[PDB]
Structure formats: structure tokens, C-alpha cells
Amino acid sequence: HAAIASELQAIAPEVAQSLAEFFAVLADPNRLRLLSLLARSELCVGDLAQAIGVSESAVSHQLRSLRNLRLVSYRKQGRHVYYQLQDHHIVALYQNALDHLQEC
Amino acid sequence: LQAIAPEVAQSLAEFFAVLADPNRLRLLSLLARSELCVGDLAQAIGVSESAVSHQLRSLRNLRLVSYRKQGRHVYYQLQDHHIVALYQNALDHLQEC
Numbered sequence: 264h265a266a267i268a269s270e271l272q273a274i275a276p277e278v279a280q281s282l283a284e285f286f287a288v289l290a291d292p293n294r295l296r297l298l299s300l301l302a303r304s305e306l307c308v309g310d311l312a313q314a315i316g317v318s319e320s321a322v323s324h325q326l327r328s329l330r331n332l333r334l335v336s337y338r339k340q341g342r343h344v345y346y347q348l349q350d351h352h353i354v355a356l357y358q359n360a361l362d363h364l365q366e367c
Numbered sequence: 368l369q370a371i372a373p374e375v376a377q378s379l380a381e382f383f384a385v386l387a388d389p390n391r392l393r394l395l396s397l398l399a400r401s402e403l404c405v406g407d408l409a410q411a412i413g414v415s416e417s418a419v420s421h422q423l424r425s426l427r428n429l430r431l432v433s434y435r436k437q438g439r440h441v442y443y444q445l446q447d448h449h450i451v452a453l454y455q456n457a458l459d460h461l462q463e464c
């Protein structure tokens with residue numbers, strides 16, 4: 264019987280359901296490759312396409328759902344559109360997940 | 368630059384896939400605040416000790432949780448601090464969005 268076992272309670276089923284869906288969104292090798300690039304630098308669709316070795320149309324399409332899913336965001340500067348990870352939570356959960364499997 | 372190797376991306380994808388389980392997340396949400404014995408978790412979750420023990424076996428094999436011996440009790444805890452951090456960050460991100 265842990266010291267504070269009586270003081271704890273699990274996350275609500277609705278919250279756990281929403282969190283599970285979030286992780287389901289990340290269980291995609293293609294999405295993770297794109298996020299691995301944005302974790303190190305903000306990049307334009309042109310740079311991402313060259314790195315992953317796919318067309319700009321393909322990256323642009325994948326980035327759309329990523330944007331809708333609130334995993335990435337973008338900023339416009341002059342004639343360029345730079346994509347970035349949504350927030351620091353995204354890079355942290357990404358880096359921690361990777362470090363975890365590296366540490367096993 | 369270069370993206371992560373394809374097998375690394377695949378392993379990471381499978382890792383997030385195992386986390387896409389509401390029941391596992393409820394268990395992890397408890398361990399995120401304290402290591403706990405099977406009895407404490409079973410009562411918190413409202414399920415039998417046998418059930419939680421079974422759920423924990425899977426989590427152990429998946430390297431999400433570990434256990435240790437402290438006196439006359441076995442306590443389960445999250446495998447490492449990375450699990451702690453990714454859980455909290457994912458949760459906070461969802462709470463603000």
C-alpha cells in the first residue's frame with residue numbers, strides 16, 4: 264500500500280480516450296519522420312520534401328492533417344512559409360519517446 | 368538535414384501505438400503520481416487484482432512499467448522518467464489546445 268495510494272485517482276475515461284486518440288495520431292512512421300526534421304529546425308515544404316525524398320505536393324498534403332491535428336504550425340515571412348512543431352510539448356514528448364526506446 | 372532512419376520511425380510509431388490505449392493510460396496516470404502495488408491500482412481502477420496484474424504484465428513486456436521490491440511489497444512504477452515526461456507533455460498539450 265503506497266503512502267499516498269488513497270489520495271490518487273485515475274484520469275477520467277473521457278480524458279484517457281482523448282489522450283489515446285492523440286497517441287494514435289503519432290503512431291505513423293511518415294508523420295514521425297516529418298516531425299523529426301521539424302524538431303531540429305523550422306523548414307519550408309521544399310526543404311522537407313528534399314530531406315524525406317518525396318514531392319512537395321506529398322509533404323504539403325501530409326502537413327495539412329498535421330496542422331489540423333495541432334502537431335505543427337507555420338509562419339509566413341515574405342514569400343516563404345516555414346513549418347514548425349506546434350509547441351514545446353510536441354518536441355518534448357517526441358524526444359522523450361525516442362530517448363526511451365534508445366534506453367532499452 | 369536527414370530525418371530519422373525508417374526503422375527508427377517505425378519503432379517509434381509502434382511505441383505510440385501501444386500508448387493509444389485508454390486503459391493503459393489510466394494505469395499510467397496513476398503511476399505517474401506514485402509507484403503503486405497491484406492492490407492500490409486495482410482499487411483505484413475498480414477492477415480485480417488479477418486483471419490489473421495481467422494488464423501490468425503486458426506493460427512490463429512493453430517496457431512501459433517496471434516493479435521493485437520494498438520490504439514485504441512489490442511496487443510497480445513507470446519504467447523511466449521519459450515515460451513520465453511524454454505522458455505529462457501529451458496531457459498538457461491536449462489540455463491547452
Ligand SMILES: [Zn+2]
Pocket residue numbers: 350351352353459460461463464
Ligand atoms: Zn501544447
